Tab-separated table of C-alpha atoms and ligand atoms in Angstrom:
chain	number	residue	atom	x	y	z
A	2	UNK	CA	0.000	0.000	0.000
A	3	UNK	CA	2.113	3.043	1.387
A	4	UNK	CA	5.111	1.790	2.386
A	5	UNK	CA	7.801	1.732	-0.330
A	6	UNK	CA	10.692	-0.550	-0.185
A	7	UNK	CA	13.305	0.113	-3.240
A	8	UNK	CA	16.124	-2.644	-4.110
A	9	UNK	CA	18.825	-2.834	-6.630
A	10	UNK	CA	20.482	-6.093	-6.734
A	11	UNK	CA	22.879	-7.918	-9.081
A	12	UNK	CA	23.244	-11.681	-7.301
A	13	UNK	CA	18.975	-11.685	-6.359
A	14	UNK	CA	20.081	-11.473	-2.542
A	15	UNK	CA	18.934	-7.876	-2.257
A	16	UNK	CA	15.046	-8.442	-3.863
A	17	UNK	CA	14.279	-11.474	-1.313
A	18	UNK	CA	15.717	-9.642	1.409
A	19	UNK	CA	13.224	-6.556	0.457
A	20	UNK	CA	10.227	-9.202	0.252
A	21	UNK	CA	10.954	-10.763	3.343
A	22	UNK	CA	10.765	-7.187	4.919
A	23	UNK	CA	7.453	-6.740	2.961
A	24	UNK	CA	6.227	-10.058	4.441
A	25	UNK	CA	6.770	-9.255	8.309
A	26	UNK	CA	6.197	-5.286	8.308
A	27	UNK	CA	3.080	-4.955	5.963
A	28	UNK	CA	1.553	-2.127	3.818
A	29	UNK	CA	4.558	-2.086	1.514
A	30	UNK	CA	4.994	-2.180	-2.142
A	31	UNK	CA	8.420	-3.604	-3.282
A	32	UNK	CA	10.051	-1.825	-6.638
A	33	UNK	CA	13.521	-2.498	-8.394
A	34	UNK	CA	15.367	0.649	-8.598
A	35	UNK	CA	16.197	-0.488	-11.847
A	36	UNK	CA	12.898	0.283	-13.081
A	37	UNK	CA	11.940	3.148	-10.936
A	38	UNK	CA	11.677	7.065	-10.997
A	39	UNK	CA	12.245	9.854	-8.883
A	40	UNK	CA	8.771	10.564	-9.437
A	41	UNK	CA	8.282	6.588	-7.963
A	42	UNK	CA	10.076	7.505	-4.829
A	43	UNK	CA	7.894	10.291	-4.084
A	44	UNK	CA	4.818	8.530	-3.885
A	45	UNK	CA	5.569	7.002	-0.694
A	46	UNK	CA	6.318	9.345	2.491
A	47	UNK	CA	7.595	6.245	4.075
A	48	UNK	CA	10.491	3.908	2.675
A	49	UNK	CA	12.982	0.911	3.201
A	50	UNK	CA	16.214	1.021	1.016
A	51	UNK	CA	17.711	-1.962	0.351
A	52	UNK	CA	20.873	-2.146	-1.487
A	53	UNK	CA	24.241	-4.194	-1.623
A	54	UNK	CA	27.657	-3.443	-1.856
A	55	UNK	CA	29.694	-3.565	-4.771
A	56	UNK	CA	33.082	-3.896	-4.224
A	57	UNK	CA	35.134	-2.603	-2.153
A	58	UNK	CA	32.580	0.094	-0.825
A	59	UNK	CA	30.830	1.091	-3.667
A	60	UNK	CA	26.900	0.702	-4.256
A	61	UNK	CA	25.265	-1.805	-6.387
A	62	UNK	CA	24.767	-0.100	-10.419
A	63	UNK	CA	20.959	0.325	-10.620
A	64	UNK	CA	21.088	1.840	-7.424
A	65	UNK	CA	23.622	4.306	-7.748
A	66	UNK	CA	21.932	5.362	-10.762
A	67	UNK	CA	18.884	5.856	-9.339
A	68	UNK	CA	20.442	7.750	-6.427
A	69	UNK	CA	22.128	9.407	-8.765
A	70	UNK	CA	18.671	11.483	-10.240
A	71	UNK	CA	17.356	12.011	-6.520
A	72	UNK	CA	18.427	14.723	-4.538
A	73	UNK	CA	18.565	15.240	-0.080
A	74	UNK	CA	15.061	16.763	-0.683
A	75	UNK	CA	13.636	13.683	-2.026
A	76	UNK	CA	14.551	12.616	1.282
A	77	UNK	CA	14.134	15.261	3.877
A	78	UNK	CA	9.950	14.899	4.262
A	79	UNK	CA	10.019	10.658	4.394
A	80	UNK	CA	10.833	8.242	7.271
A	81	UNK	CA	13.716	6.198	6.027
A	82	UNK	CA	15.328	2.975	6.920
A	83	UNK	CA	18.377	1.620	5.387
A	84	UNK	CA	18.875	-1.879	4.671
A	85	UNK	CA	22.555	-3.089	3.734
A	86	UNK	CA	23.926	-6.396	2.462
A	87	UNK	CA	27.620	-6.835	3.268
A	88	UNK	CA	30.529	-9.403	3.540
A	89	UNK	CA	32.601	-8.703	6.526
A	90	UNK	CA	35.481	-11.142	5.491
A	91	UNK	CA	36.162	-9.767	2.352
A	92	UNK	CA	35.336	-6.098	3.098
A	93	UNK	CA	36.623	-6.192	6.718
A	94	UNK	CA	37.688	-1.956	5.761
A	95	UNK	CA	34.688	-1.001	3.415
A	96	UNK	CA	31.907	-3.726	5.364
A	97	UNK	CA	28.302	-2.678	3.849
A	98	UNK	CA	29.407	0.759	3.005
A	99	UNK	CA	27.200	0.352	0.153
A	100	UNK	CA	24.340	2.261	2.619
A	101	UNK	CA	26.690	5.073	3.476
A	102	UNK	CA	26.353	6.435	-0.284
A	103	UNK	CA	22.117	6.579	0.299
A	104	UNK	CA	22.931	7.985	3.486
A	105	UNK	CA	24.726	10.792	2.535
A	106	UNK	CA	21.092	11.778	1.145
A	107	UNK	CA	19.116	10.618	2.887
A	108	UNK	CA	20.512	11.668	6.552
A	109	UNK	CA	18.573	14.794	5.821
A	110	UNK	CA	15.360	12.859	6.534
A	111	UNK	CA	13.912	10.820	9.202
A	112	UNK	CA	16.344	7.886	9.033
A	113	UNK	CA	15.500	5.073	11.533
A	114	UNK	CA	16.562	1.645	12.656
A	115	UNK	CA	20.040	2.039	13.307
A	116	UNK	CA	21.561	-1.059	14.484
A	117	UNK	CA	24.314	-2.093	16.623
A	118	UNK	CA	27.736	-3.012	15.229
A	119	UNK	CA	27.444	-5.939	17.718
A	120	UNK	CA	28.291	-9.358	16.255
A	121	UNK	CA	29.603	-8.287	13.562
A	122	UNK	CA	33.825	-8.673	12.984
A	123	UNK	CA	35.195	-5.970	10.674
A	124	UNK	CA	37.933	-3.192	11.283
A	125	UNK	CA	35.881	0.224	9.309
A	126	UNK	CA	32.831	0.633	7.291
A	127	UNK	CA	31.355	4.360	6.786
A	128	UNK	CA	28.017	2.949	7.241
A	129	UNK	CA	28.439	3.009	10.921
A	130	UNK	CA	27.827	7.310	11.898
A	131	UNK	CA	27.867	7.939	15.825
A	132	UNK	CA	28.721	4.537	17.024
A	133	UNK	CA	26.040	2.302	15.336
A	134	UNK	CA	25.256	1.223	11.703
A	135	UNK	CA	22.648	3.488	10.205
A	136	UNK	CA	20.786	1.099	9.268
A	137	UNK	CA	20.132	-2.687	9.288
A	138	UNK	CA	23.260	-4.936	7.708
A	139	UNK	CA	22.999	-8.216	6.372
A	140	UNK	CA	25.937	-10.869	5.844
A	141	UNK	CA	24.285	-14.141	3.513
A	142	UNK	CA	27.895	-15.278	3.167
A	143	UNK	CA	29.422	-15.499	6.243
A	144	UNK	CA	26.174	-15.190	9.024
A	145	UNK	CA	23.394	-16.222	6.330
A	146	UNK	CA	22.037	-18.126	9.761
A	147	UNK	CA	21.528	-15.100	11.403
A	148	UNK	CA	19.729	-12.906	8.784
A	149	UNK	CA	15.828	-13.981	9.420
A	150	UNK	CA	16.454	-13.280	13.570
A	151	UNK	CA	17.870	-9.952	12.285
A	152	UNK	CA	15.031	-9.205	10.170
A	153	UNK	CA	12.340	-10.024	12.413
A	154	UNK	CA	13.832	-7.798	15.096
A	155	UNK	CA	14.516	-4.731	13.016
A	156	UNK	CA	11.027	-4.844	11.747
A	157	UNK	CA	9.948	-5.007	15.170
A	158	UNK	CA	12.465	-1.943	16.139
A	159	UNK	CA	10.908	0.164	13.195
A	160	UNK	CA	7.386	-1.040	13.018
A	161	UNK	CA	5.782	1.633	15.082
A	162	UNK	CA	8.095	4.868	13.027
A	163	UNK	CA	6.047	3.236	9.964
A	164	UNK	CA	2.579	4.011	10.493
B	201	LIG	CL1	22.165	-8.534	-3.809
């Protein structure tokens, strides 16, 4: 219905991470990046951004194009969480930094659901602002066992700032 989650993928990981989201908040329409509009975007007030890492830091193509046509006030009257997907092994310096890039926008909002950089084993990642990640960080290669637990609480940290 209202609430609009946006993903950009390249491995898949990204899309079923966005529906599972869909699944246990509710009220949510989920929309590839890839195929969405600036003019999409702002027909929610309320969103979930979902979007990988690419390389060492970078974010995943579709969405940095997409990012790339929005602006901070596309962002500034929305509630906002972030969603990244990360591997902590590889990218022990640059882990999920993929969300810092979005945030750098989208800071300018309402951004909830910041998450503890507890039990997770990396040295630096720029999506983690004021002691916590800004937003919710999945690992499907090294703590794929962990990700539904993590879901399920964040949507239960967040439910009540989507309304
Ligand atoms: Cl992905």
């Amino acid at each position: 219905g209202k609430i609009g989650i946006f993903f950009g993928t390249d491995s898949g990981n990204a899309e079923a991470i966005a529906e599972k989201i869909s699944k246990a908040i509710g009220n949510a329409e989920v929309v590839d990046v890839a195929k969405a509009s600036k003019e999409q975007f702002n027909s929610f007030t309320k969103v979930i951004l979902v979007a990988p890492t690419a390389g060492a830091g970078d974010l995943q193509t579709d969405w940095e194009d997409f990012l790339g046509t929005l602006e901070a006030s596309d962002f500034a009257n929305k509630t906002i969480g972030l969603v990244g997907l990360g591997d902590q092994d590889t990218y022990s310096e640059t882990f999920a930094e993929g969300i810092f890039h979005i945030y750098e926008k989208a800071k300018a909002g309402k951004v909830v659901g910041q998450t503890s950089t507890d039990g997770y084993h990396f040295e630096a990642s720029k999506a983690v602002e004021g002691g916590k990640f800004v937003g919710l960080v999945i690992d499907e290669d090294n703590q794929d066992d962990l990700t539904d637990e993590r879901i399920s609480k964040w949507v239960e940290q967040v439910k009540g700032s989507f309304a």
